[PDB]
Amino acid sequence: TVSTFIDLNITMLEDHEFVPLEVYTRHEIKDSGLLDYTEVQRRNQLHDLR
Amino acid sequence: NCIVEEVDARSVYPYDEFVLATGDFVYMSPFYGYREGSHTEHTSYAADRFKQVDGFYARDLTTKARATAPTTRNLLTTPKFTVAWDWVPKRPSVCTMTK
Numbered sequence: 615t616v617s618t619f620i621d622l623n624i625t626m627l628e629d630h631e632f633v634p635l636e637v638y639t640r641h642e643i644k645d646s647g648l649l650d651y652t653e654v655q656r657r658n659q660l661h662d663l664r
Numbered sequence: 665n666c667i668v669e670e671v672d673a674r675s676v677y678p679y680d681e682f683v684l685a686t687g688d689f690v691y692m693s694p695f696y697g698y699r700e701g702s703h704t705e706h707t708s709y710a711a712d713r714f715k716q717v718d719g720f721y722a723r724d725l726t727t728k729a730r731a732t733a734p735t736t737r738n739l740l741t742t743p744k745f746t747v748a749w750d751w752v753p754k755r756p757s758v759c760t761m762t763k
């Protein structure tokens with residue numbers, strides 16, 4: 615068999631899922647400061663009851 | 665009133681000083697000591713205030729139980745308190761990057 619047809623190949627672009635990605639979370643940013651003022655306050659205001 | 669209290673400690677680069685959970689800046693590298701060029705590290709304190717203890721053994725205050733293994737201790741007495749922390753080498757302890 616010979617053919618008079620001209621081929622053409624089209625495959626659909628497959629699905630692709632995007633997972634959530636973060637370089638730094640806000641908890642790491644809150645921990646970036648050398649002294650979280652709030653936690654220092656809460657610790658130091660327990661001295662009499664401790 | 666005598667008070668013994670365990671606290672956390674946080675130092676940022678270059679790690680020539682750190683803080684404590686109460687908020688007190690200790691002006692000395694957490695790795696300053698006597699072994700392997702540790703006297704190169706920074707301490708703005710008179711050298712008599714800092715004492716390093718080889719083969720120290722720690723006794724729990726509540727459990728009243730000596731335990732663990734020899735831990736080379738570091739003690740620095742400020743004009744208002746005295747801190748004790750296990751001396752560890754600087755290179756294997758910290759890192760400038762994060763996986």
Ligand SMILES: *[C@@H]1O[C@H](CO)[C@@H](O[C@@H]2O[C@H](CO)[C@@H](O)[C@H](O)[C@H]2NC(C)=O)[C@H](O)[C@H]1NC(C)=O
Pocket residue numbers: 623624625
């Ligand atoms: C039509 O579609 C593609 C080319 O766009 C070919 O399918 C892939 O071919 C590769 C080798 O080139 C195989 O490893 C894959 O298994 C094939 N499928 C996919 C989804 O990649 C296919 O061969 C083309 N048709 C012809 C006749 O070549």
